[PDB]
Symmetry: C3
Subunit: 234 residues, 3 copies
């Protein structure tokens, strides 16, 4: 269950299944279908992922399949395929967080390019308390915060506030909850209003070079910089 609304190039993905907004197998498929269509639609310029209320996203719902593995293997491989596609998405992805982002719910947020929270927003990786470990969510989280920060979240399973998240680089800015909706809408709207071709090529190049050494990064980046200056929309 997903709500989709397009307004001036901005596509807002409003996560259903209130209040926990769980990443069930059907939710992951719905989120991936919405993304495959968005990346192929010229009308969609920017993506906004909103999990409304008290909980941004609780992660996968602890549902029961017990016959024979095959379900959990399908679940995680599809979840990883979504998170990969979302982080490597050429078009800007923004997460609007008003509450708690836990487990795979923190991953969804961490996989977005930008993340804006209200002061009441809490962040967690609770695996150790449930007799597990958040291996897959720590992949996307480890890319946005320092090695000490992710190690403490994963090992202790504690809930962290918005202030710690701002200082760690988990979110971009903390805004009062009445201003959060407008801030994201204006920021996304302005992003949608710029010359698109250099934006997508620029974001794609940025993601690719962060996994390359300095020398190869400049080899990739330089011709991409020439192309921006040769663009008719400059």
């Amino acid at each position: 269950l997903l709500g989709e609304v397009l307004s001036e190039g901005v596509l807002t993905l409003t996560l259903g299944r209130a209040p926990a907004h769980p990443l069930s197998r059907a939710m992951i498929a719905a989120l991936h279908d919405a993304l495959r269509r968005a990346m192929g639609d010229d009308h969609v310029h920017v993506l906004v992922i909103h999990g409304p209320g008290r909980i941004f996203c609780a992660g996968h719902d602890l549902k029961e399949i017990g016959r024979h593995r095959a379900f959990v293997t399908d679940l995680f491989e599809a979840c990883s395929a979504l998170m990969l596609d979302l982080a490597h998405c050429p078009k800007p992805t923004i997460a609007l967080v008003e509450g708690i982002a836990t487990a795979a719910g923190l991953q969804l947020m961490a996989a977005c390019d930008l993340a804006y929270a209200s002061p009441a927003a809490r962040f967690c990786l609770p695996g150790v308390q449930n007799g597990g470990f958040c291996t897959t969510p720590a992949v996307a989280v480890s890319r946005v915060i320092g090695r000490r920060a992710v190690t403490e979240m994963a090992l202790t399973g504690a809930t962290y506030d918005a202030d710690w998240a701002l200082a760690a680089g988990l979110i971009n800015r903390i805004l009062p909850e009445a201003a959060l909706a407008t801030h994201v809408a204006d920021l996304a709207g302005a992003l949608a209003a710029r010359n698109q071709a250099p934006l997508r090529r620029g974001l794609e190049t940025l993601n690719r070079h962060l996994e390359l050494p300095l020398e190869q990064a400049y080899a990739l980046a330089t011709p991409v910089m020439v192309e921006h200056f040769m663009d008719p929309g400059r």
Copy 2:
């Protein structure tokens, strides 16, 4: 020497040779020997490294009075040090550093190689390599994986001493806790970590360490079957 006490899965390694706790060839061998025994013992779940007093660890015993005008000894010492620190960082079991004072050179490295680190306000951090006419190359390795590029470069080049507040911002330490509550928080946290389900904890930490050294797609290829193993 190296005092080692075990509780409910919490092995606390107390550094000897007070007050500076120098990382001598003997100390390096003792720390590596203690780590080896701890990794193959089911009863040891979490490791707590502690250097009590005003100094956490001075890093490398200045007994470089060696023979190869010191060369063979110096090569042996640094290879054994890198072998210990590499195995400490890549330890499947959680390692915590309890800091009450000054962590210098290889001592700051020892702290950096740990999965977690907790300090008191009086705790100081430094890479003094330039003062003696050298450079903290090996200690800079573990420190560079824990703090930002500009931060490592400043510690290394200036050789200055930094306080606890700077170390928290740079991500060198996890949290600052008062002297009266430090030794209890680390013990409580270590106990909490030792009481959790052990198999998915070690398999998850082992995976976090190696996926951090991989590109996104490859990290997701290694992590997904491990995440399946957790739930089973």
Copy 3:
């Protein structure tokens, strides 16, 4: 124009063409020539890149030679990248002295230095998207200096950020009062110049090399270098 004054092993490179200090084809060639010399002169121990005034560096000179201008722009960016890579890998310590606004390729120049000090007035920006483009090459040096989300927000929004944000993001090492900054940089640079130079240069290039390698390979590289320090006369 580029002014250079050597004193106590510290070569302060003062950017000319005030107030903007544009990184024109001439300025890039002058900065590269000033870098090649010094790198080959034992008398130069520490480098200081200065850009006096309200502006540190505006970035590239916005003059487009319009058949196309492609075979000029390609030569500009290639040479810009050749300088920034050379500057980042330079074994001799490089320090930026920022007191004003460092924007576009000007922020790149700053980010490529080993250390950077600023006054509380100093501003930082990547305005690419405002002019219908994207700061792709400047983002390369900046992304090796600040975290994932901080660089993503700078490039996508194009907004300007203050010194406090730069300190927190790690873009600059320390904020100093306006009437103390120049002397703090001169006292620090002088202290590095008086240090035993061989292990300093050897240790700096090794640090930059191992940060692009996994842990095991990082130690295989670093360990013999540490043995070389202890065998050096000093």
